[PDB]
Design a protein around this ligand. Structure first.
Ligand code: NDP
Ligand code: NDP
Ligand code: NDP
Ligand code: NDP
Ligand code: A1IXP
Ligand code: A1IXP
Ligand code: A1IXP
Ligand code: A1IXP
Lengths: 250, 250, 251, 250
């Protein structure tokens, strides 16, 4: 038949764009969600209606507990269960909020920010590999502004730095098994829904390429390339998709 | 009207694969060469037979000198003369040889060739490209190993480092003009002309992903992505196409 | 009075050498240890015999847990309790072992120790150090020069060391308005593993361009000493590799 | 007896502070200069007043041309003829001005910005290494902001990137001879004399640590460390001395 992909947090925003675009490219997909049951279902609906029985949903909480392992195993599972194979893993799901050094308790923050951002990708990676001709690859959602961090976002930043480390080490380690591991690093994309609107323009104006944020589909485009046969020799690479934002000094 | 691209050192090896593949994507192509007259003319005949009036050649020495700006201006001008437009510039041409710090070319010539082709020509070509200015982009052929260099290749490495700087500086500067500037960084690809079987397998053995060098087409694939509509928010980015080679410790 | 420093995992190897050199430069020192009780007490004994009332020990597991914040707070408080001040924090303590992806400690346990010691505890200690400030304040984080060219099957260790880089940068940024500098020291190959054979040692030694030998503990401490000194008063968010060229050598 | 150090562009500003700190440390110094003869002599006289026969001056243009190799050989020679040895080389001299891609000629700009910042350091490095017959080191003055460049500084940035490559390449190659090679990367240091205080403050306010530029002495302090017995294992390292400026996003 046709290849299959798991996308994490695929309900909304960047994950949904990735999901749809993988589908259009001919992937059967698992739409993982935590909170967005509705949205997951609706997207599955839309993809199933397009090609019969090619989109399934999956619940899991990706916080750092004692049960993350099983959850990550569950997610990889259902991809094999629904489609009998798993070609692609997109690590998209992610928490993001400030954690000031001079001031949810901390370990909540750690489980979410370190847990979702780093540890869960590590576990999914381990399951994806464990259960493996083909074109297998993993794509991690990184952050182009990792070296010029937002003030008071240490934990978030630590977790994204950790994700670069996983990208590198897993690319090395899984290269023998023909599994590629890559990253996509957005700058400013879909801005926080809560963040002010006139405040949003402030950020848009800093971006060299067209004074605007990346659309979700732009991010998705890079993911598509990395999983494709056009990237068959690409592993351990992180592709920034930031419109030049990371090149701009203070 | 199909867009137009200049590829430097497009007569052989990776440059040829980039020109071919731009052509197969719908571009008209200026094939720059220095010495490889026959291969140059040969390729253009092949492109033109495939689609008449779609390929030209343009001879130029890319060694640094007081007339390199005029030679660079001429390469770009050749594209406007042939095709009435210049949409893409691929900085591919490259001198590569050892320049030990501790002891037939003079050092003046070594600097001219290694710094001229790898860095100064790209800069002058970028300047000419932007001056004569849809989906405009420049792709620089960089080097994935530039922070773990070959022993005794200081001038080469300096040139490739300079090219990274050019990639970033021009991406920043040319963004408001809608011109994107990116790089592709091979690890080990098409291997040298003068090298034994034993030595090839030595290098190949180092590559985590499949224990082999990149095909030129694999390198060309990333160039294709960067110039395409799928990369319209990507600028100042360098994509490693190295099979994990740069991840491998001594 | 004399400034005070907290050094984590300071009973042996690189931490001890850092504690010793800070002590010789006139610091009062907290020697944090986990398991190495005899060795920590021995070191403090030596340092106290050198100038009385200048060295204390402090026991803490730096494995991630819900009590890890309390333990890190307690480490910092030990310094204020002993010496009335805390000028320098060195995050040296580190777990180091393989965690293969394609496969005995549970994975829960691996994550707790490798991410906890190498990254979370540094963050918590960073927080406690800064909050307790109410001179030349700085933090030095022991990083790893080979993080972008890692050992096969050391995913979690590498992830923690990359996190520590992120902490170094983020904390340099956030704490600079308080006058606290935050930097890193990144060894290549230094003191080899106690359980490693001399045969394997020489394999690693011969890869080092500068001298074909590992860094001495002193040489690593030397860089730490520079970063805390007034010769580094404008330096923050910098990581100095002390690796003999090792990270420049290709495969 | 006393070790000897060559410092380039040592007449004024940062190179001056380095010469002085090296002298105070016990070094005999060659004060290289291009135009500031008056400045160079006064420094030399003052140093020589502190300690007889410990300081000499040497004039040379470090621009790129067929005579540059000879010039750099002569600079190194001047240390040996004066002091009988050359233990340290500090590549400090630098040209810095904008070179927009869109009243000097372009070839002149290339010659000056690539010549002073990259090529002359390479030639000096070669001459330093070849003339050796303990604690030998080279320190290259880099730039902490090379990945977040000033707009329209492409050539400057290319030169500073090249210098990073030299540092790394020469570190690797000279390590067997026991010559360490490292860099110091200032952020904002001595601001131009004639720059308005109101402008100066715009840059000053960007700096996290103390909201001021680095003194020349602070930069020199990092140089002193790298040449010292405390840095005996450090090679191929670049120490940013930037007060956190490079960590600050747009
Ligand atoms: N937005 C931007 O501008 C930038 C984004 N990025 C990165 O790109 C990726 C996508 O960003 P964006 O779409 O804005 O992300 P969001 O912050 O909106 O989160 C995306 C999804 O993550 C899931 N998620 C969050 N926390 C958990 C958790 N504890 N367990 C399980 N799932 C969880 C949610 O799924 P559910 O809805 O089902 O609960 C949510 O829809 C992230 O990795 C992010 O860090 C990086 C830099 C810039
Ligand atoms: N091959 C590999 O494994 C790797 C290559 N790269 C990079 O990828 C790109 C393509 O590599 P590859 O195809 O191997 O390159 P080649 O070594 O085959 O050279 C490409 C072309 O550069 C041209 N060139 C050389 N000197 C001059 C000069 N003075 N003036 C004008 N043109 C000149 C030549 O044109 P002509 O033949 O007409 O004289 C030559 O065919 C380069 O920029 C290279 O640095 C990066 C790392 C790995
Ligand atoms: N040695 C080398 O070659 C290199 C070292 N580094 C870094 O340099 C630093 C020093 O290296 P090195 O001296 O070899 O380190 P070690 O591996 O010897 O560990 C130092 C100390 O870490 C402490 N530690 C370990 N696990 C825990 C834990 N769960 N809770 C609390 N403390 C713990 C131990 O204290 P105790 O003995 O009391 O149990 C130990 O003595 C480390 O951060 C390391 O990663 C970087 C690269 C190379
Ligand atoms: N100051 C700052 O904020 C920053 C500086 N840096 C780097 O720090 C180093 C020192 O900085 P700074 O003191 O401000 O530098 P300056 O701009 O003051 O230049 C230092 C010296 O360079 C010499 N020089 C310039 N062009 C030439 C040439 N063609 N031939 C020979 N010598 C030449 C001059 O010698 P003379 O006067 O005798 O002609 C000059 O005094 C440089 O390498 C610089 O790039 C990096 C980032 C920031
Ligand atoms: N899960 C999520 N992770 C992230 C990470 C980053 C952002 C984000 O909005 N980043 C922008 C940082 C930035 C920094 C400086 C200038 C600008 Cl215009 C933008 C948003 C999100 S949402
Ligand atoms: N114009 C050209 N530029 C370059 C640059 C690099 C190479 C090359 O062969 N690079 C491989 C270097 C290498 C470094 C370490 C391990 C391995 Cl297997 C290979 C070949 C060329 S040809
Ligand atoms: N807590 C500890 N952390 C670390 C981290 C790294 C090392 C170490 O020995 N790293 C060497 C890795 C290496 C990789 C490639 C070549 C070589 Cl000569 C050495 C040893 C330790 S002990
Ligand atoms: N030879 C010389 N090289 C350089 C390099 C850089 C500078 C300089 O002024 N750099 C500051 C760049 C900068 C960029 C963005 C913000 C801020 Cl406050 C400062 C000044 C000089 S003088």
């Amino acid at each position: 038949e046709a290849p299959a992909a798991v996308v994490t947090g695929a309900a909304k925003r960047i994950g949904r764009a990735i999901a749809v675009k993988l589908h259009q490219t001919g992937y059967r997909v698992v739409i993982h969600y935590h909170n967005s049951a509705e949205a997951a279902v609706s997207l599955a609906d839309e993809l199933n209606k397009e090609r019969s029985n090619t989109a399934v949903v999956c619940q899991a909480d990706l916080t750092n507990s004692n049960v993350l392992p099983a959850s990550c195993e569950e997610i990889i599972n259902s991809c094999f269960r629904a489609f009998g194979r798993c070609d692609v893993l997109v690590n998209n799901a992610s928490a993001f909020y400030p954690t000031p050094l001079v001031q949810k308790t901390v370990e909540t923050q750690v489980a979410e920010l370190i847990g979702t951002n780093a540890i869960a990708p590590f576990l999914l990676t381990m399951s994806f590999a464990q259960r493996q001709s083909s074109n297998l690859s993993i794509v991690n959602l990184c952050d182009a502004m990792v070296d010029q961090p937002c003030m008071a976002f240490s934990l978030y930043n630590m977790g994204k730095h950790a994700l670069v480390g996983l990208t590198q080490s897993a690319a090395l380690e899984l290269a023998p098994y023909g599994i590629r591991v890559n990253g996509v690093a957005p700058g400013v994309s879909l801005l926080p829904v809560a963040m002010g609107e006139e405040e949003k323009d402030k950020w848009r104006r800093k971006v060299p390429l067209g004074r605007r944020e990346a659309s979700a589909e732009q991010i998705a485009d890079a993911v598509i390339f990395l999983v494709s046969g056009s990237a068959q020799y690409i592993t351990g690479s992180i592709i920034k998709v930031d419109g030049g934002l990371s090149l701009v000094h203070a």
